[PDB]
Structures are given as structure tokens and as C-alpha cells.
Amino acid sequence: DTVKIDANVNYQIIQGFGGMSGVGWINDLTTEQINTAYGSGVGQIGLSIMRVRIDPDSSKWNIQLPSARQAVSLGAKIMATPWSPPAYMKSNNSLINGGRLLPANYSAYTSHLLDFSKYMQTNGAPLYAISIQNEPDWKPDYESCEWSGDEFKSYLKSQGSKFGSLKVIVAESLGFNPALTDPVLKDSDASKYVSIIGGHLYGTTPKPYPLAQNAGKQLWMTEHYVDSKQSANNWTSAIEVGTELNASMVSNYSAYVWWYIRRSYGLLTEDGKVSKRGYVMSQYARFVRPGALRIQATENPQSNVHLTAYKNTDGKMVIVAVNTNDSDQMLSLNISNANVTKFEKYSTSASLNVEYGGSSQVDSSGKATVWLNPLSVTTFVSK
Numbered sequence: 001d002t003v004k005i006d007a008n009v010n011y012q013i014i015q016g017f018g019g020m021s022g023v024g025w026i027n028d029l030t031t032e033q034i035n036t037a038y039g040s041g042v043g044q045i046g047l048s049i050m051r052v053r054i055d056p057d058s059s060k061w062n063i064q065l066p067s068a069r070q071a072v073s074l075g076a077k078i079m080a081t082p083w084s085p086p087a088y089m090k091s092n093n094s095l096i097n098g099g100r101l102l103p104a105n106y107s108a109y110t111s112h113l114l115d116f117s118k119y120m121q122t123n124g125a126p127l128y129a130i131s132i133q134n135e136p137d138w139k140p141d142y143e144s145c146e147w148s149g150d151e152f153k154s155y156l157k158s159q160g161s162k163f164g165s166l167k168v169i170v171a172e173s174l175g176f177n178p179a180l181t182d183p184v185l186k187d188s189d190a191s192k193y194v195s196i197i198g199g200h201l202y203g204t205t206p207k208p209y210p211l212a213q214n215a216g217k218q219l220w221m222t223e224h225y226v227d228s229k230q231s232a233n234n235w236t237s238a239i240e241v242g243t244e245l246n247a248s249m250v251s252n253y254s255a256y257v258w259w260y261i262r263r264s265y266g267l268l269t270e271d272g273k274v275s276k277r278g279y280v281m282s283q284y285a286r287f288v289r290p291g292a293l294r295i296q297a298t299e300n301p302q303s304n305v306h307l308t309a310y311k312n313t314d315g316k317m318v319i320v321a322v323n324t325n326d327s328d329q330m331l332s333l334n335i336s337n338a339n340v341t342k343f344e345k346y347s348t349s350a351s352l353n354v355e356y357g358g359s360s361q362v363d364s365s366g367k368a369t370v371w372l373n374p375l376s377v378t379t380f381v382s383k
Helices: 031-038 058-073 103-122 149-163 210-214 235-250 276-285
Strands: 002-013 016-020 049-053 077-081 129-131 167-173 196-200 218-224 255-260 293-297 305-311 317-323 329-336 342-348 355-361 367-372 376-382
Touching (some): 002 305, 002 317, 016 077, 016 276, 031 058, 049 058, 049 255, 077 103, 077 167, 077 218, 103 129, 103 149, 149 167, 167 218, 235 255, 235 276, 235 305, 235 317, 276 376, 305 329, 342 367, 367 376
Parallel strands (some): 002 329, 016 049, 049 077, 167 196, 196 218
Antiparallel strands (some): 002 293, 293 305, 305 317, 342 376
């Protein structure tokens, strides 16, 4: 059915796609694995964001440097998340099962975070962004710390100015619950120090956040994974990554950051090879590059077809479509306000990994017909 595209109507800017560096909790990435994930060529995923954990013990920070340095060398931006302040700053004197950061320690905690930023920077892996807390609404039996949105608000009013040009992220809610961040965004004295509203998708689905958008903050999805009991090469499950990426983009997110890059259910499997989930991610990350603008395009032209469209800074139009029908699907593109004469097709499916599927001509009235293979994630790139 018909898809109407207007390259003169813009939504969010895309900062990129990322994953978690897990060294300290799991084995480090190798240099080869980072090059595969952070390169953007054939066979590579195209990530450009790496997330790192801030250990409350600063004697352990050094183990983060090899992977963070390699990523920066390859053009990536680093964001850092703390799971807990040091135990001795919290109300329960423990790293685990929550506990509150004592207000008397707000300046000390800021100094801890800034120390981490200076260490990284001095060692040649400068941070782009820093989060105040991981999942303040979750109190598991590992590093965690509980906060309310009013506590974030008080914290930021007193400490926020100290972060300088570092981009501050709040609140990394488990389920992207606005309750944690609305108090911050409704207070201009707190809001002025926040650059990014970040959240996770556990137990939820992507949704727009109008208050964050109207406040001019970017929205980043800073951690998720799908059904970890599945092999990353199970196609039935991997296509769900495509669904979630599409929903995230339609929800005006500027960044999407997976959990552990290398894992049995990850973007790379434990043999260091790209997985089906990684190829799905690459249908977005290799082609929708940092700086791209999402543009108007019929999102659900027909049953079980979802798509988004982008203009890259180099002038290329890109269309990324998810087809969860077990049948070939035709799209009738109608493009306005663009200078496109052909699209190249690249698909991931049960049997293809980002494989070229031929070219389609766009007539001089901006019309083209393209086809989606069954149960596939397909990217069209203008030439």
C-alpha cells in the first residue's frame, strides 16, 4: 500500500546506536570485537555509543580504559552510568538492595562522578554524557541506589552547575516512568542542568514523552535487551529487536543503547561473530548515521509493516521497514520535497544478513515500488 514521505517535515536528530561495555562484571571485549561493533562497513554493526559503569571503588576504574579508548578511537561517544554510590555515602551503608544517597553527601557524590570523568579524560577516553543514577526505581541484590524525582530535583539544583559541558542524564528509570523525571522538568532551576532524559524499557514499550521534548531535552533509551533465554541467532526472537527499534524511533528517541554487546543473547555471540540481533541493529546503525534527521513517513502503511525514514547529513535518504508478515509485501512510495532517483535494498531475514536485494527507480514525480521479503528488516538507501 501507499507510503507518503515528506523530507521537509523533521522529527528528532539521531545521535546513534550503542551497547554496554561489561568489563568488571563480564569478560572484556577484545579489540577485534570492538572494531566489528563500532566500524560501519560490511560485516560491522555501526554502533557509535558505548556505555560504561562507574564502579564505586575507584581502584577499579582502570579496567575500563582499553575498551573505552578503542571506542573513542573509532569515533564513538562514551556515556557513563553509576549503579551505586560508595556504601558509606548511603543510608543503609551497603552497595545493594537500594539505600538512599544521604543529602549531606550530595557534594561528595558529585566529586566522585567528576573524578571519574577527569580520570577518563586524562587517559584519552573523554566522556560525552554522565548519568546520576541507574534505575532509581529498582532495588535488587546488586549495586543499586534509590531516589525519588524530588531528590533528583534537589540534587540538580545544588550540584548541576558543576558538571559543566558534560551532558547530564536523568533518571534511567527501569521502565521509563515519567514520575521520576517530571519533577525535574517542571522546575526550571533543575531542568536547565539536564541535557538528556534517559530511560530503560523493562516491562514496557517505547512511548513519546511530550514534556521532555517540549523542554528541548533529547530522549535516550540507555539500556534494554529482549528475551535473554533465546540464542541471539533465533530469528523468531531477533525480529522483535526490529519491532522495538522501530517503536523507539517513532517515539522520538535520539539514541538506543543495548545491554552487553557480546553475550549469548547479544549483538555479538561468544565466538565474537555478529548475531542476527546484531544484523538487525546494523540495518539501522550502519545506514542511519549520527546527525540524521527522522522525517515524515507513513508508519504503518499496511498490517504488520512498520517503517521510519531519515535524511542523513550527506543527503542520503534512508527507509527502514519491519515486515512481520510471512509474505512478500509491496510498498508504493510517494516522496515529496526530495532529490532521489533510486534506492538500494538491503535485507536481514532468517536467511539473509544485510544482503543486497537490487535497486528501484524513483520516477520524476517521486514514485517508486519496493518489496519487502517475508519476516524481514529491510533498509532502502538512496544512491
